[PDB]
Each structure stands twice: as C-alpha cells, then as structure tokens.
Ligand binder design. Structure first.
Ligand SMILES: *[C@@H]1O[C@H](CO)[C@@H](O[C@@H]2O[C@H](CO)[C@@H](O)[C@H](O)[C@H]2NC(C)=O)[C@H](O)[C@H]1NC(C)=O
Ligand SMILES: *[C@@H]1O[C@H](CO)[C@@H](O)[C@H](O)[C@H]1NC(C)=O
Ligand SMILES: *[C@@H]1O[C@H](CO)[C@@H](O)[C@H](O)[C@H]1NC(C)=O
Lengths: 49, 50
C-alpha cells in the first residue's frame, strides 16, 4: 500500500467529445486552458508528439 | 528503474557467442520495488546511438 505502480483510477473521463466550432475548456496532456477547436489536415506530428 | 541488489564486481556476458563467465550484475529475484519498467525499440543496423 501507498508505494509501487498499480494505482487506482482517481482520474476524469478521457472523453472523445472534441466539439469544434464552440468555446470549451481543455486539459490536454497536462496543459490547461480555454479555446475553440477546428479540425484540419496536418502531417507534422511525429509518433512522440 | 527498481530497487536492485547490485554486485561488488558487476559485468555483462554477450549473447552472440557467450563467454566462460555468467552475466552476474545483480541478484534481486524478489520482484522488487520497481518504480518504472519499460521497453523501447531501436534499429539493429544503425551505427551510432545517442
Ligand atoms: C522487455 O523485454 C525483455 C526482453 O525481450 C523481457 O524479458 C523477457 O521476459 C520474459 C517473460 O518474463 C522471459 O521469459 C524472458 O526470458 C525475458 N528475456 C530476457 C532477455 O530477460 C521483458 O519482460 C520486457 N519487459 C516488459 C515490461 O515487457
Ligand atoms: C555458469 O552457470 C552455470 C549454470 O548455473 C554453471 O554450470 C557454470 O559453472 C557457471 N559458470 C561459471 C564460470 O561458474
Ligand atoms: C533502420 O531500419 C530500416 C528498417 O529496416 C532500414 O531500412 C534502415 O536501413 C535502418 N537504418 C540504418 C541506418 O541501417
């Protein structure tokens, strides 16, 4: 107990509810803020980004 | 990254053509307090690593 790796949840949804066009809150991978999403076609991300 | 029991004289032993010794750089067969455990992959034919 209280040491190791196999933790319990304690976490939020991880919801696939990316709602574009409106203003939302976000907590993406640690970074928090408010913004508007908009879908686009991009290729500059790599497999660690 | 664990809580290992390291030797006084650690070494490794190659696997392509093994030597007379035995790769004995720890003995901690207790599935010990491992804070981190991971596996990543790399190219076998690449000359340098960084
Ligand atoms: C990371 O890879 C190593 C080597 O591929 C894994 O070690 C093997 O684990 C299996 C199952 O416990 C054993 O039967 C083999 O003898 C091990 N090989 C060696 C060379 O030690 C290791 O389990 C992998 N780790 C994770 C977290 O997947
Ligand atoms: C290496 O380990 C094997 C199996 O335990 C043993 O038979 C052999 O003698 C060991 N080698 C040395 C140099 O002690
Ligand atoms: C890296 O791996 C790829 C896939 O096999 C191979 O084509 C390439 O030659 C490797 N890189 C080097 C420097 O050998």
């Amino acid at each position: 107990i209280n040491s190791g790796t196999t933790c319990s949840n304690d976490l939020l949804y991880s919801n696939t509810e990316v709602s574009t066009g409106v203003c939302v809150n976000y907590d993406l991978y640690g970074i928090t803020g408010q913004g508007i999403f908009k879908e686009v076609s991009a290729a500059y991300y790599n497999n660690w980004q | 990254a664990c809580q290992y029991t390291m030797c006084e004289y650690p070494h490794t032993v190659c696997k392509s053509k093994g030597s007379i010794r035995n790769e004995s750089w720890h003995i901690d067969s207790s599935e010990p307090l491992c804070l981190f455990k991971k596996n990543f992959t790399y190219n076998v034919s690449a000359d340098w690593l960084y």
